[PDB]
Specification:
The structure is cut from a larger assembly and holds three copies of chain A and two copies of chain B. By secondary structure, chain A is α+β, with helices and mostly antiparallel strands. Chain A has eleven helices and twelve strands. In chain A, strand 2 and strand 3 form a beta hairpin. In chain A, about 35% of the residues lie in helices and about 20% in strands. Chain B has one domain. Chain B contains ten helices and no strands. The chains are: A alpha+beta (about 375), B mainly alpha (about 160). Chain A binds three DNA and RNA strands through helix 1, strand 8 and strand 9. Chain B: InterPro entries: CRISPR-assoc_prot_Cse2, Cse2_sf.
DNA sequence: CGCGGACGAAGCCATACCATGTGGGCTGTCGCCTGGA
DNA sequence: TCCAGGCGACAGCCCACATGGCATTCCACTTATCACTGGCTTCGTCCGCG
RNA sequence: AUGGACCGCCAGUGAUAAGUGGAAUGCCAUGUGGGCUGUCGAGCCCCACGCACGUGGGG
């Protein structure tokens, strides 16, 4: 009930997700530096793709007061009645003197101090519960320091509204641990299979209008960049996912679309100026019934180069899957697709013809 | 730790007079930014990270523009003095100092020449001696010297700022 | 009578169990920092796995009053009769007024100061002894300050009910030193075989619904992570384990499942954001009849890199096991499995084919 | 006639014997802090192992009245007759009103104030001497303040009954200076060879059952641990040991088993959760005929690291033993075993093959 | 002499953490660590201009500034409600009023007072954050200057916290007649 | 029978809440070769 | 023999970013243990030794 | 040769048994490094042959 997915994807000279100063994130694995792509980045691209197709819109935000007030102004409420209304809806949960909120701003609707994660119909329904108490909201707004008047039970029941992205990726809310759902997909960081140093790109910004006595450009900097063959992995705890979704068919659709989004997508970080759109050179899905397992140790010993890295990484992943398969014997299902027909990878299962076919047959075998 | 500073000082004066005097060895040491180093700075070196700390800054010395070529605070003070006086942007040199102070040994020699040359293009005074003992000290303890640079920078920047009013 | 188990397991860029400030726990070994995984974490993951299979459910908790009250509400008692009942079961032990209880919550059974560790049938049976004295409990609730009325002998004998996790890991209870059981498994902390510094990972939480069309994001931070090749070790004192379990057949099942859970499991600390699930690249079980032995000193001199660490760590553990074997001669059994067919590890015994096979042949030899 | 033994043993991240607050005991040597293991802890582990093999059970206790009464109840005496009997055995040995006792807590037999150190057959024989005067003891219990009736000469001769652990470690008894036996083994504290600071582990025992709204740990705290390469040393005065034991074969067996237990054993302080069992990486036995000598001054200048400490400690002990040997020349015997074949330690004597071989050849040469 | 700088820092940091999050987040990530650790390379911007001119003094400033920025929002919302005591007095006011465990606080106080310059910085942050978890009014300037004088002798700052703690405990108990 | 060694006999005992400020001492360097003084 | 010069030719300039964001709750344990020995005074007698 | 000379406070000791820091997270949106260029006589010694212009051999 653990769907493991491995994939070797070689990214050209680009910068997927930079650090806090421009440089690309790097790991120190097996003694050598290795550029890496954070897990949250791919998880975000994946979610936007999955929910993109399955138009669920699992909006993550802070300014819920602003949009609840926006829905209330669309449904007839006045500006102040809407603002005080939304602030009452968020403040009417009353754990510890109501919800915790940031220092109020001059005139805009303040943003809660905790990031919510709800679908859009949830916001609409919150505005509905707010609209059902018009008189009550006005009556509290007439005071100077109002309190909660909303039925914290049902609004608290609206915050528990899950979603495909909520089910897979999970949610956290400290002030309301009753709505906290645990994630079902273990997403790992993507590190290179070979040590790569960063290359300093010197770029200049030229001004298209000339003055005499100078030819200086509009700007001068050095953006860091790096290329390499990234290794990626993810696990899907089927049991817990079917628990979150409840049904088994919706769960099957969510895992199938998840896997297709995991292979398909590529982040949008510094991609407009360095097109790095690519496809994984190796895709290996395995269905394990005891515990998920990653092939990261295969890539601890860094690979020296001057040659290619796709073939060496593929066949070396093969060897590690072979010995690992004969050291932790288990009755599991294995399948893999590959964009190179030179070698034949035996230990990776039965070579399917294409990525979507592989995903379909593996999700099918996983029920 | 001063035993490296004095040698570095002799090297900086001899190299300064040598670059303004003889253009041949100037352009020959500038090409590295390395046999020329083996024949020029080798007699001023007593861990190879120290030796590279000498010839690397020697090349940076020979690569500076003429305006700043014909002319004790560390590099942090130098950057603060450049930012306040000569209009450099604070939010940019701060980001550059963090960028340099976070890297390892092989990183500072890669991101340092451009910034040192750029601040030098405004006739800023870099006590090259201590810069050589700093890049030498980068091997013994990296985060300690980086700390000195960042905290020294902010310290003298706000001290001079409040001192100006 | 000492089942020793060693294992080299290389964990990728992750954070198994953070410290009280986010960073991973680190040792200062051989002069260099070395990230480590505390023993309590692996022991917790292991037990949850063993009791998972062996559905014994060795619940560790404080709120026993609340759950006993839950059992009494399931069995017909009223809310107040259940609460006062459970408090009577707890207050009728200890050589003083009762076991130390302090500051209750608001509308809910208080929490004992000490920590209990019992199986689920034990709690149920506690509710049973409480159920046999309905009238007594009701009579005591009528007063203002009730006292103990329950037969401390049998409830105290129910608190002594052991379990697989209780047998292996042991229990402590100050108010009842008669129920304190001593552990039989020595579990060691897992330190890297090479000095590793922490890696700061700047991260951001983008927020939808833009207010100013700015690229301003709801939240920023920097979480500490670290990777490396951890060394792990554990001992199983057969003698004391057979004493706790009593039988010799139950003990064999507990030790076999212990070793398999020790290799299989990995904690659940910051895994949803970094899948650090892995298997040990080297497993060495040894059966010693005189004293347990650890290979920690072999990894004191940190290993410098730029190369791999799996092969170097494996062959170095081999060398240390060989010279150590020829310096402390002993009649022991040795076997090992390995996920690398490059080198030949002689001193580690006879290379079995797989982890479960090695475990079967070694538990058998025990 | 002095068997000196030196040993370098590196203990991993652990806490052998904590202080009165959890922290590990530390010395301030050569200016720097150094975690240490007290001498009495190792001495206790050693004795329990030696007596373990040589099943002598040199029980050190206070409740001699309780066990003498138990022995008398096994042999037919009534509970009160046994209690009063034992109290007669203890009350008939001091100057008057017997040895000093403590306030009786329960109706249970009281505990004497001093610590006795006897083997189990000694207690048995004491119960025998008490049984030889059944009627007399019963007659004394009839009074209100009884006195001594036992033949203090033979019971005093029974308290002087030695043992292997009594012979080596010695005994003290203030109220009976006639039974005081002097120890024959000088055991030294074990301090690290490099300055080590303590490090805090943050642990949270979490409760297994969830609470209605929130979920927090059951208890959070932090224990102090430390790792390092300890130096250990001990002396065995053969002359006085053969004097205490009397024979030379029993003495030879006692010293051989002492050395083997000294290398083998490791304390039991928080080992159930750290698995810090290890062996000395270097063992140096020397037999000197003039005076015992320790190598502590060699390790005064603390060692800086980032590298290993085993090799540096080994070669530095070598250096100090070499120059020290050429400054205090003497015709002594030197032998050593080592778990690291990189360097060759010349000054330590002739490299035997293994620890038990080294001990056998050195005890033989003595 | 140092107390004055201490009051400066406590002033602008006490208003800084509540008035803008950038510095509170750059300082929060520096609790209990060395002034040169890369993770704290973002805190110099705010703290570096106030240290005067030994490392014990800077350790004191950075460590306690971080402590002031890592306290929970409850403790800051009460910290911003609007001779003098050490933190020992704070511990006694915490046990006597807010019901902490006496026998525990006593052994944690003697545990911390019995350590070296580095043990007070590793054990201190969780202790003070626990005290601010119970919202006891702790004085920061005295805490830092104390840590500053903690480096010349481990006797002149410990003994006064222990004796001051017990003194104020028995005065709070004798005053409860 | 003659006697060693060890103890014991007391005199003695003891109604007109607050504090601490300190430090300072060690180290060696080059560019080499021809010409002229 | 020692001080001093020298040692083909090796580029100049100009420009260097603006903004926005930095989270919350909770948990902090128990009990048992804490030694004796003495540094006074003379003599007579008493139990044990030879 | 000093209110001193001679002069041991001292023989015995596990601090012990128990413990997840845990759940959540795009660092992002924008950039010419540029204008200019042929790589074409002092040297230290020996010997040989020499048209006293030099040529070759061994150091």
């Amino acid at each position: 009930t653990f769907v493991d997915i491995h994939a070797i994807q070689t990214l050209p000279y680009s910068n997927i997700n930079r650090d806090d100063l421009g440089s690309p994130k790097t790991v120190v694995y097996g003694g050598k530096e290795r550029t890496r792509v954070s897990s949250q980045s791919w998880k975000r691209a994946v979610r936007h793709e999955v929910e993109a197709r399955l138009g669920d819109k699992a909006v993550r935000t802070r300014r819920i007061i602003s949009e609840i007030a926006k829905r209330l102004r669309e449904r007839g409420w006045d500006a102040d009645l809407a603002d005080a209304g939304a602030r009452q809806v968020v403040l009417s949960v009353g754990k510890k003197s109501g919800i915790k909120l940031e220092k109020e701003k001059d005139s805009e609707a303040p943003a809660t101090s905790v990031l919510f994660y709800l679908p859009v119909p949830a916001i609409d329904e919150l505005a509905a519960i707010a609209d059902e108490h018009r008189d009550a909201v006005a009556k509290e707004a007439a005071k100077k320091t109002p309190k909660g008047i909303l039925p914290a039970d049902r609004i608290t029941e609206v915050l528990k509204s899950r979603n495909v992205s909520v089910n897979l990726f999970g949610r956290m809310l400290a002030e309301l641990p009753s709505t906290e759902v645990d994630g079902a997909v273990q997403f790992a960081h993507a590190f290179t299979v070979h040590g790569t140093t960063v290359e300093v790109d010197f770029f200049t910004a030229v001004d298209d209008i000339p003055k005499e006595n100078d030819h200086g450009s509009g700007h001068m900097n050095a953006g860091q960049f790096s290329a390499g063959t990234f290794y990626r992995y993810a696990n899907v705890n089927l049991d817990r996912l079917v628990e979150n979704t409840g049904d088994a068919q919706t769960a099957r659709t969510a895992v199938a679309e998840f896997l297709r989004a995991f292979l398909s997508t590529v982040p949008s970080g510094k991609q407009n100026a360095t097109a790095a759109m690519t496809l994984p050179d190796l895709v290996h899905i395995a269905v394990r019934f005891d515990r998920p397992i990653s092939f990261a140790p295969a890539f601890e010993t860094a690979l020296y180069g001057s040659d290619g890295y796709t073939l060496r990484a593929c066949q070396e992943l093969n060897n590690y899957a072979e010995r690992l398969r004969e050291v932790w014997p288990d009755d599991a299902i294995r399948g893999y697709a590959t964009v190179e027909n030179k070698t034949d990878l035996a230990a990776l299962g039965e070579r399917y013809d294409s990525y979507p076919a592989l995903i379909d047959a593996m999700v099918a075998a996983a029920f | 730790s001063d035993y490296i500073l004095q040698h570095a000082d002799a090297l900086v004066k001899r190299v300064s007079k040598l670059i303004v005097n003889e253009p041949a060895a100037r352009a020959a040491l500038r090409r590295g930014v390395m046999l020329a180093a083996h024949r020029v700075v080798a007699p001023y070196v007593p861990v190879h990270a120290v030796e590279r700390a000498f010839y690397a800054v020697a090349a940076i010395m020979a690569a500076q523009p003429r305006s700043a070529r014909d002319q004790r605070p560390n590099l942090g003070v130098s950057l603060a003095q450049a930012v306040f006086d000569k209009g450099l942007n604070a939010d940019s040199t701060e980001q550059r100092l963090h960028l340099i102070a976070r890297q390892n040994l092989d990183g500072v020699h890669r991101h340092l020449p451009r910034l040192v040359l750029y601040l030098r293009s405004d006739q800023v005074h870099i006590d090259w001696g201590i810069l050589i003992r700093d890049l030498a000290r980068w091997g013994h303890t990296p985060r300690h010297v980086a700390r000195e640079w960042v905290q020294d920078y902010h310290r003298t920047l706000e001290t001079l700022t409040r001192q100006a009013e």
